[PDB]
Structure 1
């Protein structure tokens, strides 16, 4: 299957005998599922996202079927609003990002040029929006709040901003605020023809 990014890239998963929907998330290092019944031992862990941290239960060597593809890996369970399939499992199902083809054994980082400045950013199929660290941008902005796995942050919203993503030009909305990682979300991924392939 090839997947464009005009909509959230959702898949059906089977785990612990149960069926769920989950987000294919190139921006996530880990796989994090809403609270659910799994069998066996687990270790406590803390994981960060936009908004802060959540406590999760870590289950190792869990079998999961992702759209009919089997993988064994670590699954985290806790207070996430969305089930997310992260790179630890995406690699096991041959997932690639294409716009250059990009495997997911490492974070899919790209160089961007925005506001006359060069930065590195994460290609993030799990993000609806594009969120950049604090930086100087010109023009009017609007206040907004956006949510992530740890809660919410306040950002400045800039509309109709020109960004160059690995040489490919897009114009769209960019949010600026206290994110720890520059994130290219689906609003801009679609403009550079990014697709998920597995």
Structure 2
């Protein structure tokens, strides 16, 4: 089965006996669910995203059913804006990125060429938009706020910027700001024909 990225890759999961909607997120190392009760022991942990760090409860060896596939692993619970299924569980259910095939054992980092520079960037199905580290691109831009795990950051929005990714040409909106990692979001993933497969 194949999941395209023109919309957010949302799926129903079953966890602790309950159904929930969650986002299949190649940009997350970990699985993070909104405030809920889970049985058993847990430990306090901190995780980070765009916007900064948040406190979560780490529950280990939790069973989670996703797209009819059973995973058993770490589930973090905390003030995430969206329920997220990260690579820790995507790998268990055999999910890969395809356009060539990219497994999710490691962060899916690839070289992109943009505004005449080469940079490493994260292929991120949990990102609507493409966000790059600070760079002085020419052209008109307009300010924008984008949200992630820890809150919002201010970015500059540039339109119709050519980006080559894995040898595929793309052209579209690139946001530039103080992101901790360069992110390729669905706006450009769809253009290079990337899908999620299992």
Q: What is the TM-score of this pair, normalised by structure 2?
A: 0.99
1:118-197 matches, within 5 Å, as 118-197=118-197
Cross-structure match for 1:13: 13
| Structure 1: tracts of 5 or more residues without a match | none
8 Å CA contact retained: 1:42, 1:57: yes
CA displacement 1:154-183 (0-9 Å, x = unmatched) = 000000100001111101000000001000
Cross-structure match for 2:101: 101
8 Å CA contact retained: 1:60, 1:75: yes
| Structure 2: tracts of 5 or more residues without a match | none
8 Å CA contact retained: 1:115, 1:136: no
Q: What is the number of residues matched between the two proteins? A: 198
| Residue 135 of structure 1, CA deviation | 1.1
1:48 matches 2:43? no
SS in 1 for 2:91: helix
Q: CA RMSD in A?
A: 0.5
Separation (CA, whole Å) in 1 of partners of 2:174 and 2:99: 20
Cross-structure match for 2:79: 79
Runs of 4+ in 1 over 4 A off after TM superposition: none
CA displacement 1:81-114 (0-9 Å, x = unmatched) = 1000000000000001001101100111111000
| Residue 34 of structure 1, CA deviation | 0.4
SS in 2 for 1:191: coil
| Residue 37 of structure 1, CA deviation | 1.2
